[PDB]
Amino acid sequence: RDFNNLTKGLCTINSWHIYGKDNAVRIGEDSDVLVTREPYVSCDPDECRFYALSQGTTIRGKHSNGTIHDRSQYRALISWPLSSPPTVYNSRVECIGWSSTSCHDGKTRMSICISGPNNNASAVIWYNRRPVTEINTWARNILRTQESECVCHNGVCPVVFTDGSATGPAETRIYYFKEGKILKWEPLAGTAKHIEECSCYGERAEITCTCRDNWQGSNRPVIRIDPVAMTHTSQYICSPVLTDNPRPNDPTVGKCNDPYPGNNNNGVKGFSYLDGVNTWLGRTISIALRSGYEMLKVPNALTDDKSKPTQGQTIVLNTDWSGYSGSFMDYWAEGECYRACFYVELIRGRPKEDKVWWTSNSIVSMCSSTEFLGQWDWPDGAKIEYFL
Amino acid sequence: RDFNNLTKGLCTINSWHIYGKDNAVRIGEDSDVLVTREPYVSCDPDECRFYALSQGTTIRGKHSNGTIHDRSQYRALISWPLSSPPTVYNSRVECIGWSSTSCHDGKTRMSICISGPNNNASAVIWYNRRPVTEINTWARNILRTQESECVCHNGVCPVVFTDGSATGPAETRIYYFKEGKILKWEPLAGTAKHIEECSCYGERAEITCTCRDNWQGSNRPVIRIDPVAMTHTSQYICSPVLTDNPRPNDPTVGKCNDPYPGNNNNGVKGFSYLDGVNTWLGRTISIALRSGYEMLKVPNALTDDKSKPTQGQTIVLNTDWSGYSGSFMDYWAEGECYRACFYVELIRGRPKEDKVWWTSNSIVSMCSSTEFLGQWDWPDGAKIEYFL
Amino acid sequence: RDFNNLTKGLCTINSWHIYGKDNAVRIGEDSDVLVTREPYVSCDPDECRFYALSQGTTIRGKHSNGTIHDRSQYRALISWPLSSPPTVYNSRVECIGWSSTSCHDGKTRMSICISGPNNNASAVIWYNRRPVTEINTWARNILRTQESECVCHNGVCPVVFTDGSATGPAETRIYYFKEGKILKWEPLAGTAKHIEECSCYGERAEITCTCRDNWQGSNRPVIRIDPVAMTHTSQYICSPVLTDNPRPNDPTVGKCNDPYPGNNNNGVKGFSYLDGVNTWLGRTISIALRSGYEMLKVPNALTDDKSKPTQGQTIVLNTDWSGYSGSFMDYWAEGECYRACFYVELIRGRPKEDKVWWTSNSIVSMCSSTEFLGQWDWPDGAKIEYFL
Amino acid sequence: RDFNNLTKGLCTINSWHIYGKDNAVRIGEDSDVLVTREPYVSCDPDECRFYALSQGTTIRGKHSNGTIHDRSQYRALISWPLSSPPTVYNSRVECIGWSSTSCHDGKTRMSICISGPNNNASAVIWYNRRPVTEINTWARNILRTQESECVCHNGVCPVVFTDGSATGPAETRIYYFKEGKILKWEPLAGTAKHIEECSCYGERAEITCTCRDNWQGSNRPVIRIDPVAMTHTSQYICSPVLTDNPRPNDPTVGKCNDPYPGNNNNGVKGFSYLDGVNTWLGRTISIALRSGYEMLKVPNALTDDKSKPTQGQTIVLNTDWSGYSGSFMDYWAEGECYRACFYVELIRGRPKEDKVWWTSNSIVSMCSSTEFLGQWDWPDGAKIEYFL
């Protein structure tokens, strides 16, 4: 009907309640479920769906041997109904590619998939389910994107891309689209040294994305965008409570405009909600590998380089695997504020579970509450040995 | 369009005709059917669906070993099309939890799921498919609810919860919701000593729920609610025709405001239609275990402590298993009265059938007729030995 | 929108073209297809669907052993999309029973299912998907109905039932319904001695049903109904070209008001289009068993007891099995006349193919053309030995 | 709503981007996917679907042994959702036959299927999903059609048929339909000697179809139609860059009105976009067999018998199988021109891969871009040995 505008603010978060859960690997043991990875959730004005990058095979199927690789001609962006598994018979294909992003603007939805060789990949922008715009590689080394949903304000929806090295300086750019057409684009600015896999949300005409520095830096990069003026800035989260993985241990003071040193050439997609005292950071529990997941209330994290934990909540125990995590919100829900949500990818199989030749994932999703609810941990459930 | 109001009365019941049947366990032998339990039926203005608490696995699947437990992170409230099985590809998820209730109000539908540990569980109320309200545990010992549908009158829909011991005094409360928001709540009143798993229906601006006393008492508790004034009372069904399971034998006189003694720490979810001479009680045939099912016309049951059977009808033979049973009606059907219906859960597997490692169920459903129709028995059908 | 009226006449038939085909048994070898029997086709204002009486099991499933029986608590009336198989995931249940009929009236659809023991069965009438009317057994010996679709004229839809013996005198009645309510009913009249499984169609405010005499009589009974006056008559098709199965050989002259003698206690559901010179009778090729199928132009069959074949067309070869057959037409298609159609059930398995423990069927359907098209035979396709 | 008119022109093509991909054979290894062949794509005003001629069996199913044959009573025209596999549970049947074509006109869609024996086949035309017109064989030797979609202009949609010999002179005719009714038909004209499997598109009130000469001729026949006047002409593509398969090698000069000699009794369905300098021809890489696929910019191909390659792009490598290819466009997309698309069938199994007893295919589809995007090759993916 009409373009949506970020008119409200974030509700206060005093705890988190379960929103959705897949149980995909448990069910996939005896069903026609698709091997996926790199998921997310995204809302429309009438329903919210689950999203993922398919591998073009069922888990129990023979072609699942070798699904440890990321880029192939047999991947695609698919969507399915909330808390149901990525079934072969109930899934809908958005576009063909091995990297992606998607978002609705009040009128219709825009989806972007990237495909191709390393020497020269390319992005195609779709809108109202028709292919509208195309963009070829600029720095000729794996053109990539968010891996989670974008946000729009009155028709304009910014998106972040990177093209170039993963263990050194790259070429990041913020593009501004309106009905699938490029309005403008500008290169990265600010003090952030490496950008990758941005997780974004919005409130009161502003967009905040917490991203990943894969080069060096256990603290996380941040990008604030102004959808009306079409401008931005970047920096790091000051707080000493580090959130990348892998990472060293938490210190007494942190860094605001420089990567905190300790581990190289590695990271993980993550997110956070930056709102003064109402600030919460998410992270794995293990400093060495992707296991466990926890949420932490760290007042004034982004601006205070000494801030420490006030309250917290456990999502997945440290004996249980996790993976990626990102942000989303239901911009079309009734209320006076925006209720914040997030998802956590639960990876099974290789590399850590190598008696199996595949790699796949599960999903758990939570949203905020204004009460102080009790906590419980939410693992995937599957017994790898039933697959031997 | 507009809120629904309990404007009619109950039609006269002279017999029951089949409404719906699943045949889930028969079909699940060679299909992708989900292991479920604790079912019910619920109507919308345009279609009536089947409901159940999934276990997150298919019957023939490996993860079905151990589905004898009730509370787990892998259960969910699902719905599917009438007289079809709970298939993996045709099911819709309402919310995440191990206890529940749901009902439409004329405009939209409200669903409630409860999840968490025993020390501290919590309920989340959803409306129009978005999470609106949250409630944490009050007495810190398994917060639980109806296990069947609620009833609404002009926007207000009462719901009964219990939190605390199952073999002693607990904390029951009636909550009044309007569009997912808590209007009010009040503690139990009247002479009923223990409340659990209420089965409710409505006619002429009043709501009657026949429940379960798991502490002591083979006779059943009753709760009458006034949706307009937001008040209630409780008591027991006077009649000597006992209906809980397990239970002792029928006596000559019964108890109106006190639990009839005989068996402890056990019961089963049940229901009844209380309407003077037009009164019918349902019950298993075996006094010791959940087998067989029969309907009995006992005039003035609730107020007469000597009332005895006038007419009856067999639903499931005593050589056949049954389980839970509850009430529902199609508030949007054409006519001058409300045609009363009920469902019976048919459990297969453990505990009684232990050559199998799972536990699942089937459904049969009937509604009333004004004629005196012939009777037939309706078992599940499956041969356990085809699963060995 | 508005009630439909039989306003047109039959187009001239000069040949038949394929309309639809299932290929169910071929596909069911490696799919979740349901064991069915007693099928038919029925149109709505917007789509035409396939219909059948399910057995509550998949073909490859264990519970298919013993599906040679007809009456059981696990059967149901289901419908699915045209030329697709009766799949477990794509089927819709109309009502519970082992005998049936259904038809749309311009506004909504009425469906009727019969269930129960032999001593006392009962029919429930549904309308707009809600159970409206009930009727108990009158002569206490297997109450049964059409096994194909009914026809309506301005809201009124007659239906034929039988209750009593199959090898002697019974109790037939024509019921007249309007929105699921009984308008009237009257007993059989005319010179027909035994009625069973009527196949009906309509044009110019009249309804003709060709039925089955299971007692004695290789020639077929006929019932003409006047939907406006609510009256009828019966008789036999005069022509010497006999069409029941089993049957003796064709003679030189036939019988108009008396069963032609030759074979007892046996028959098969069939049909015909009676329209003067534009008359066509259908029948199996073998006089002893259900094999092959052919259509024959026999001018003035119903009134001329000497009429013989003018033109013909082969549908299924005599080396291929067939079974039941019935009539249907698309009352909502554009044109100035009614294009006539029919279906043939193709049975596989027991009794003739006994290396398998089940019994199931396939469907082929044809409609008329005004040209003289070429012919081809349409078998089921499946190789029974792939099931061993 | 209203009839569609070819009002725009072709956008300029500077490269091709992926549109859709099936991955059917990879997935069919562990799923209920249907054995198909002879596919295509076709758009509606609201969605574009995939099309194919089914064989009436699943790939892993027993009835897949022998699917090397083309004409049988068990084939059908089916359609399914874009980039999803032809699943047994998600497919929709259009009509019954072993040869076909289909297209939407702005209001509704017309589909045509051909069935029957070689002595006398026949076509039935369907519209708005009801059978409207019938046509019997004229030259009594396999009546056949396009095997891809038709194009319409203000209600009129021409279609090309052939009936008669494949290795000598036949009887081709162009039919003009309007709402399923034959407006007119006329025999082939111009200098083309043999016509088969036409691939058509349209822009600015004209229809161009590049077809197949199976008799003699490695260069391709062309038919230009005037939808308003209902007339046409034929000829060959002049250019020396030959595109049929099998074929001899490319010469220095070509033939405009005569079949270029070299190989007999063989060909393959193909297409091309003829637009002056903006001209592109598609073809397999191997001159002997169906392997590899490439697109070539050959300015003024149709009129210049010396034209040679200016630019090109690889679609499938020569070590990978291909098959048929055809044209389609989204006539209802926003813009000022028509964005051109095409599909390539990827055949697996017999005849070249004979360790398997079946024959099936996969799909890849691309559309044009105005940028110069990078290229990648798109194979089917499946490992035949996982089927042994």
Ligand SMILES: *[C@@H]1O[C@H](CO)[C@@H](O[C@@H]2O[C@H](CO)[C@@H](O[C@@H]3O[C@H](CO[C@H]4O[C@H](CO)[C@@H](O)[C@H](O)[C@@H]4O)[C@@H](O)[C@H](O[C@H]4O[C@H](CO)[C@@H](O)[C@H](O)[C@@H]4O[C@H]4O[C@H](CO)[C@@H](O)[C@H](O)[C@@H]4O[C@H]4O[C@H](CO)[C@@H](O)[C@H](O)[C@@H]4O)[C@@H]3O)[C@H](O)[C@H]2NC(C)=O)[C@H](O)[C@H]1NC(C)=O
């Ligand atoms: C039934 O259910 C109810 C329902 O909620 C349960 O109640 C909840 O219990 C939670 C667990 O205790 C609790 O969460 C914790 O909150 C802390 C903050 O509170 C305290 O301090 C503030 C300020 O002084 C006070 O206001 C407050 O009242 C308290 O005093 C957090 O600090 C906790 O986090 C730390 O511990 C966990 C492990 O338990 C770590 O994973 C986490 O990362 C935190 O510790 C690391 O990080 C800090 C920051 O740099 C380091 O200083 C510290 O050394 C740790 O560092 C190591 O670990 C990380 C990760 O391994 C690594 O990178 C680093 O290098 C180091 O190696 C925790 O989040 C809830 O707040 C509580 N509910 C409420 C409402 O408060 C109830 O318990 C159940 N049972 C019953 C009977 O009810």
Ligand SMILES: *[C@@H]1O[C@H](CO)[C@@H](O[C@@H]2O[C@H](CO)[C@@H](O[C@@H]3O[C@H](CO[C@H]4O[C@H](CO)[C@@H](O)[C@H](O)[C@@H]4O)[C@@H](O)[C@H](O[C@H]4O[C@H](CO)[C@@H](O)[C@H](O)[C@@H]4O[C@H]4O[C@H](CO)[C@@H](O)[C@H](O)[C@@H]4O[C@H]4O[C@H](CO)[C@@H](O)[C@H](O)[C@@H]4O)[C@@H]3O)[C@H](O)[C@H]2NC(C)=O)[C@H](O)[C@H]1NC(C)=O
């Ligand atoms: C073809 O189909 C037709 C279609 O309907 C068939 O007709 C139907 O047949 C039914 C079965 O007989 C019948 O149902 C019974 O009705 C009784 C009431 O009728 C009589 O009394 C009244 C008042 O005097 C009269 O008006 C009426 O005319 C009759 O005289 C019920 O009382 C029957 O229930 C009792 O028996 C069944 C077992 O058969 C028990 O399961 C049931 O619980 C009842 O008995 C227990 O409970 C009472 C109450 O406390 C006890 O006193 C008694 O001792 C039993 O107690 C033991 O059992 C329970 C459970 O095991 C346990 O807790 C307790 O401790 C004890 O151990 C029964 O319901 C229908 O009414 C009839 N149709 C109609 C319209 O009436 C037809 O038969 C078929 N065949 C043919 C040829 O047509």
Ligand SMILES: *[C@@H]1O[C@H](CO)[C@@H](O[C@@H]2O[C@H](CO)[C@@H](O[C@@H]3O[C@H](CO[C@H]4O[C@H](CO)[C@@H](O)[C@H](O)[C@@H]4O)[C@@H](O)[C@H](O[C@H]4O[C@H](CO)[C@@H](O)[C@H](O)[C@@H]4O[C@H]4O[C@H](CO)[C@@H](O)[C@H](O)[C@@H]4O[C@H]4O[C@H](CO)[C@@H](O)[C@H](O)[C@@H]4O)[C@@H]3O)[C@H](O)[C@H]2NC(C)=O)[C@H](O)[C@H]1NC(C)=O
């Ligand atoms: C390529 O395709 C084209 C496309 O159509 C093919 O053309 C079609 O060919 C059909 C087969 O021959 C033909 O159908 C037949 O039509 C007969 C009527 O025509 C003749 O008579 C009339 C009047 O005199 C003339 O107008 C007309 O021109 C002809 O002369 C029917 O009579 C045929 O039916 C009989 O034979 C078949 C077997 O072939 C039986 O199954 C059938 O039941 C009929 O025979 C039995 O019944 C009669 C009636 O009582 C008995 O008298 C007779 O003895 C038989 O009885 C025994 O059998 C039954 C069943 O087994 C049992 O109950 C009984 O007791 C006995 O034991 C037949 O229907 C089409 O009409 C023709 N197309 C057209 C438009 O006409 C073409 O051939 C193909 N090839 C080529 C090169 O084109």
Ligand SMILES: *[C@@H]1O[C@H](CO)[C@@H](O[C@@H]2O[C@H](CO)[C@@H](O[C@@H]3O[C@H](CO[C@H]4O[C@H](CO)[C@@H](O)[C@H](O)[C@@H]4O)[C@@H](O)[C@H](O[C@H]4O[C@H](CO)[C@@H](O)[C@H](O)[C@@H]4O[C@H]4O[C@H](CO)[C@@H](O)[C@H](O)[C@@H]4O[C@H]4O[C@H](CO)[C@@H](O)[C@H](O)[C@@H]4O)[C@@H]3O)[C@H](O)[C@H]2NC(C)=O)[C@H](O)[C@H]1NC(C)=O
């Ligand atoms: C990273 O990705 C980027 C993204 O695009 C890559 O860039 C692209 O590279 C493509 C491959 O080289 C290239 O396509 C070729 O274009 C030729 C035309 O260009 C040249 O000539 C014109 C005019 O002079 C100039 O304007 C232009 O600048 C060039 O000089 C085509 O001619 C090419 O086709 C021929 O070769 C291929 C094999 O490679 C054959 O399959 C094809 O059929 C052509 O050759 C046959 O046909 C001709 C015509 O009759 C014959 O003369 C010739 O002998 C061949 O004949 C045999 O073969 C056929 C089939 O086997 C048989 O029937 C016959 O009998 C003979 O036996 C080719 O299409 C793209 O144009 C280029 N992109 C752009 C925008 O240009 C990049 O490379 C990647 N890497 C990096 C680092 O970036």
Ligand SMILES: CC(=O)N[C@H]1[C@H]([C@H](O)[C@H](O)CO)O[C@H](P(=O)(O)O)C[C@@H]1O
């Ligand atoms: C487009 C692409 O290749 N994305 C891949 C990125 C990429 O390698 C890093 O961002 C380094 O640049 O890594 C992740 P992970 O395996 O670390 O879990 C897998 C992704 O699929």
Ligand SMILES: CC(=O)N[C@H]1[C@H]([C@H](O)[C@H](O)CO)O[C@H](P(=O)(O)O)C[C@@H]1O
């Ligand atoms: C929330 C919960 O645990 N519900 C469980 C209740 C509960 O134990 C009783 O109401 C005693 O309080 O019992 C039944 P049942 O096994 O007796 O058939 C299983 C339920 O799932």
Ligand SMILES: CC(=O)N[C@H]1[C@H]([C@H](O)[C@H](O)CO)O[C@H](P(=O)(O)O)C[C@@H]1O
């Ligand atoms: C309601 C019912 O039992 N219908 C059955 C009738 C019935 O026995 C005959 O009409 C004799 O009355 O026969 C057929 P068929 O086996 O002969 O092919 C099977 C039906 O299912």
Ligand SMILES: CC(=O)N[C@H]1[C@H]([C@H](O)[C@H](O)CO)O[C@H](P(=O)(O)O)C[C@@H]1O
């Ligand atoms: C109606 C029909 O039979 N179509 C068949 C045609 C036909 O034989 C040729 O057009 C020669 O006339 O060939 C193809 P292909 O096998 O060559 O790949 C298979 C088709 O199914």
Ligand SMILES: *[C@@H]1O[C@H](CO)[C@@H](O)[C@H](O)[C@H]1NC(C)=O
């Ligand atoms: C998977 O492939 C590897 C080589 O990639 C092979 O050695 C291994 O045995 C395969 N796994 C299975 C289960 O076949």
Ligand SMILES: *[C@@H]1O[C@H](CO)[C@@H](O)[C@H](O)[C@H]1NC(C)=O
């Ligand atoms: C189920 O698990 C138990 C232990 O919980 C084990 O002893 C048993 O053998 C398992 N059943 C099957 C069929 O594997």
Ligand SMILES: *[C@@H]1O[C@H](CO)[C@@H](O)[C@H](O)[C@H]1NC(C)=O
């Ligand atoms: C059918 O006839 C009645 C009068 O006989 C009329 O009201 C009705 O509208 C007619 N049907 C249609 C479709 O108009």
Ligand SMILES: *[C@@H]1O[C@H](CO)[C@@H](O)[C@H](O)[C@H]1NC(C)=O
């Ligand atoms: C089917 O059941 C019969 C008895 O009804 C039994 O003898 C037979 O062996 C069973 N068939 C199969 C395939 O198990």
Ligand SMILES: *[C@@H]1O[C@H](CO)[C@@H](O)[C@H](O)[C@H]1NC(C)=O
């Ligand atoms: C397929 O059929 C042929 C004969 O057509 C037979 O020889 C062959 O063994 C069959 N293939 C399989 C896998 O059974």
Ligand SMILES: [Ca+2]
């Ligand atoms: Ca890092």
Ligand SMILES: [Ca+2]
């Ligand atoms: Ca009790």
Ligand SMILES: [Ca+2]
């Ligand atoms: Ca007979």
